Structures are given as structure tokens and as C-alpha cells.
Design a protein around this ligand. Structure first.
Ligand SMILES: *[C@@H]1O[C@H](CO)[C@@H](O[C@@H]2O[C@H](CO)[C@@H](O[C@@H]3O[C@H](CO[C@@H]4O[C@H](CO)[C@@H](O)[C@H](O)[C@@H]4O)[C@@H](O)[C@H](O[C@H]4O[C@H](CO)[C@@H](O)[C@H](O)[C@@H]4O)[C@@H]3O)[C@H](O)[C@H]2NC(C)=O)[C@H](O)[C@H]1NC(C)=O
Lengths: 49, 113, 122, 75, 75, 49
């Protein structure tokens, strides 16, 4: 009977195309995208006068 | 409880020569179910916490120079050090691991001649 | 990469209690079966106690039976060794050791802690 | 092992680099190249099989490419 | 190395059992099956390519099988 | 920079078709074969008479 061994290196290759995120505190998930619309109707130039 | 006896209690060897230590058990350390002798060997460097060298007898722990080699079977085991360096001074401790009250052998020592 | 650090060693008069803490890092502490070890100066290493992976399989040596208590706290990653009825013979430097990662024995020592010394005298 | 089945074509990708982009881009092609360099005779076998199973020329080329790419890939 | 280009097929074999004939015998077939079952969409394009390349049925079928075995492992 | 883990079990099936060995002191191999010529000229059986 034999135990196979550590799979850390195998998984580090199995994750070849997956993105990485910082995990120091909570999860600071980088590598995203967001769409949004800017109302941009209450702004003032503040320099015209 | 297993009485552990180490043949030398002090070894003075000049560098470049082999030093061998014999540790004889009091009862059989071979676990019958799997047929593996459960012996262990630790080196305590001067003023340091001991490390591990030979888990079981044939096998060898990682991060260990290839010179160290365990031998023997059936209550009489033996180490060998093909070339002795200045860093091999210490307190080699044979211990059995078969039975739960783990008993080390009396500490041997190896000083450069 | 494993790092074992000790704490709690101090001078104490006989009979009084003391608790020894072994903080561990660099590995999943909860899936292991920690040991305790000691060595008086000028003497060989002496076994003390073991706590298994399951917290309910503690064991102790003959010379220290019915006098010491070993307990793990998984969340805080520390090993607690509560020692009572200490005597001047029991004083020694205490080592906290890890289990064998590669091997067959349920009990063995891969890595030894830095080591703390407890001094017992009148 | 798990070293196979890379997280390559899932499609949930973003602007930033993945785990090993530069290192994992050419791993498969390097493996096929080194296998073909190590074992040359299978090229002769593939040429023979493609010639005797391919009617047209493009079919010959495609089936030869597929064989030479599958054998090291298959194992 | 990475679990690619294993030691199988090199030779130097004998009656004593090899390292992992118990598990690695069907590993590639299981990988291909699970990849095909996790990405069933590619079968349609494989059939498309097989039907547009080949003037007979034998080369049609062999090209279909070759694509279905190249894509998951070459993944 | 990252260390990419340990490949100890990652190469543990990259090496899958080979035969195992013992490597306990003297390395007994317990595999392979060997041919021999068994010239049985001086082997007379016991208790003929
Ligand atoms: C898996 O494999 C491991 C391999 O070690 C097995 O580990 C066993 O652990 C148990 C602990 O639960 C060990 O029991 C110890 O047995 C000692 C044997 O002593 C002699 O044997 C008879 C048979 O019972 C005893 O009655 C006599 O005392 C003999 O001297 C025994 O001395 C020892 O006592 C220790 O603990 C008690 C309680 O604290 C103290 O009072 C005592 O002084 C001493 O400190 C234990 O009872 C057993 O030895 C281990 N196995 C081997 C081969 O040694 C596991 O059990 C296996 N299975 C599992 C599921 O893990």
C-alpha cells in the first residue's frame, strides 16, 4: 500500500488558465469588469464665472 | 517500555573516515501486520533542537546529506557515515516508535579526533 | 518552512502549576497529532505526552502519569500543556514536536520546536 | 493526476494575466515537439497511414497532422 | 515533470506489474469522456468538419474520432 | 514571484509506466530477465541402483 504524494504542484499546473486574487484580508477580487452609465447632469464646470 | 542500548557512548574519528553506531533494542521492533521495522534516529547539533535523519531504517529523511545510511534488522540496527564533516558532531539518539511509550536510547556523541 | 515556537517557560517553586503553550505555523494544525518532549541538561531526550488528531485520544508516560494535562486548541493554533505537581527532578528544556508527514507510524517526529526551558527549584 | 484538465477554455476571462500565461501558452506544443524528437519512427508510420487512407491531398495533410498531434497528446 | 508525456510505451517491461497499471490504464479515456460530457458543444463542430472533409465514410469517421481525441487532450 | 509549489506528487504519475525498485541499501531490482545455458552433463540422479 502506497500513498501517492503531494498534489500541490499538480494543482498549480491544473490551475493554468485561472485568474489569481489576493487573499490577505477577506478577498480583494481583482480582474473584473463592470458596466455603468453616468448621469452626469448635475455637474458644474465651477470655472465659468 | 523498550530498553535501548547504543554500542558506543563516544566516538573520536578523524575527518574523511567512517563512523558507525550500533543501537540494539530489547524486544522486537518489527510491526507484524505490515512487516516494517519502526526505528528512528535524531541528531542534536551543539546548542540546537534535534532534527530527524533516518525514519524507519532503510529510508532517509529529506534535507539530509546522502552520507548517512541506516542498516540492520530485528533488534540490532546500525548507522554509517561514509565521510565525517565538522558539522556531524552532535548527540545521535536512536529511538523506537513501535510501542506508545516512546523510549530514546542513552545519548551517544561524536567528536572530531 | 514549518515554524514551532514555545512559550510559558519560567522559574517556579515546587507544587505550583504552570501552562506551556506551543504556537505553530506553516501548516494546517488541526489535522495533526502533536507531541511534547523534554530533556534535562546532561541527559537524554525524554518523552512526555501525545494528543492525537482526534482530541479524545491523549496519552502520557509512566513517570508523568496522572500529573500533566495536554490539550490542543485548533482555532488558536496553539498546544497547551498544563503541568501540575512539578518537582525539581521534572525541570528540563521542553520541546514541541510535529508528526511525520511521510511515513506509516501514526506517531513520529518530523520537526522540533525551538525549545523552552522551565526551571524548578526552592 | 490532476495535472491534466487545465482551466484553459472555460471562457470566464478578464484583462489581467491568468495563473501561468507565458509559461502555459506553449507547454502542450513543446511536449508534442519533444515527443516527436524522441520517437522518430512514428512519423514514418503516420506518413504511411495518411498516404494509404487519404484520398485527396488536403485529407492526407489533415489526417497526418491529427495523428502526429494526438499520439503524444493521447499519451 | 508535469504529468504529461508519461513513461508508458518506452519498453523495458517485464512480467512484474508496473507502477500504476491499476489506475493509469484508463486515465486518458476517462479524461476524454469527462471533457466530452462537460463540453458537449464541440461535437457539432467536429461533425461539421468531418462532413466537410472526406469524400467517403471511412475517412469521415476517422477524422471525427481524431478530432474528438485531439481536442480534449491537447486542451 | 511565486514558487509554484512542490512537484513531488505531480511527477508521481508522470512516472507511471515504469517498474518499481527497492533501493534499500543494496538496490534489489526484482524485475527483468536473464538467459542461461543449462548444460546438464554431470548431474546424475540419486538412488539409481
Ligand atoms: C495503528 O497502529 C498504531 C501503531 O502504534 C497503534 O498504536 C497503538 O496505540 C496504543 C494506544 O492506544 C498503544 O497501546 C499501548 O500498549 C502498550 C503495550 O504494553 C504491553 O501490551 C499489553 C497489551 O495490552 C499491555 O496490557 C501491557 O501493559 C504490556 O506492557 C501499553 O504499555 C501502553 O500503556 C501506556 O498507556 C497507558 C495509558 O496511559 C499507561 O498507563 C501506560 O503506563 C503506558 O504509558 C498502551 O496501552 C499500542 O502499543 C500502539 N501499538 C503498538 C503496536 O505499540 C494503533 O492502535 C493502530 N490502530 C489505530 C486505529 O490507530
Amino acid at each position: 500500500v502506497v500513498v501517492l504524494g503531494s498534489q500541490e504542484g499538480a494543482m498549480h499546473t491544473a490551475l493554468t488558465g485561472a485568474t489569481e486574487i489576493q487573499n490577505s484580508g477577506g478577498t480583494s477580487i481583482f480582474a473584473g469588469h463592470l458596466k455603468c452609465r453616468l448621469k452626469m447632469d448635475k455637474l458644474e464646470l465651477k470655472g465659468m464665472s | 517500555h523498550i530498553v535501548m542500548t547504543q554500542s558506543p557512548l563516544s566516538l573520536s574519528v578523524t575527518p574523511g573516515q567512517p563512523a558507525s553506531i550500533s543501537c540494539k533494542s530489547s524486544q522486537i521492533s518489527s510491526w507484524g501486520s505490515d512487516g516494517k521495522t519502526y526505528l528512528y534516529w535524531y541528531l542534536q547539533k551543539p546548542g540546537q533542537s534535534p532534527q530527524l535523519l533516518i525514519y524507519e531504517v532503510s529510508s532517509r529523511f529529506s534535507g539530509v546529506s546522502d552520507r548517512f545510511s541506516g542498516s540492520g534488522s530485528g533488534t540490532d540496527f546500525t548507522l554509517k557515515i561514509s565521510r565525517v564533516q565538522a558539522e556531524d558532531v552532535g548527540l545521535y539518539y536512536c529511538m523506537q516508535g513501535l510501542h506508545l511509550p516512546l523510549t530514546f536510547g542513552q545519548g551517544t556523541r561524536l567528536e572530531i579526533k | 518552512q514549518v515554524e514551532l515556537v514555545e512559550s510559558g517557560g519560567d522559574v517556579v517553586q515546587p507544587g505550583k502549576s504552570l501552562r506551556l503553550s506551543c504556537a505553530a505555523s506553516g501548516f494546517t494544525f488541526t489535522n495533526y497529532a502533536m507531541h511534547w518532549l523534554r530533556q534535562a541538561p546532561g541527559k537524554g531526550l525524554e518523552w512526555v505526552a501525545v494528543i492525537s488528531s482526534d482530541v479524545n485520544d491523549k496519552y502520557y508516560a509512566d513517570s508523568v502519569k496522572g500529573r500533566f494535562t495536554i490539550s490542543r486548541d485548533n482555532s488558536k493554533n496553539t498546544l497547551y500543556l498544563q503541568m501540575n505537581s512539578l518537582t525539581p527532578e521534572d525541570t528540563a528544556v521542553y520541546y514541541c514536536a510535529r508528526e511525520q508527514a511521510v511515513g506509516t507510524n501514526p506517531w513520529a517526529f518530523d520537526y522540533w520546536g525551538q525549545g523552552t526551558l522551565v526551571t524548578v527549584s526552592s | 493526476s490532476v495535472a491534466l484538465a487545465p482551466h484553459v477554455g472555460m471562457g470566464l476571462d478578464t484583462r489581467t494575466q491568468t495563473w501561468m500565461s507565458a509559461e502555459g501558452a506553449w507547454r502542450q506544443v513543446e511536449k508534442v515537439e519533444t515527443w516527436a524528437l524522441r520517437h522518430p519512427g512514428f512519423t514514418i508510420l503516420a506518413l504511411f497511414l495518411a498516404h494509404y487512407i487519404g484520398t485527396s491531398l488536403t485529407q492526407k495533410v489533415v489526417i497526418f497532422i491529427l495523428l502526429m498531434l494526438v499520439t503524444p497528446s493521447m499519451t
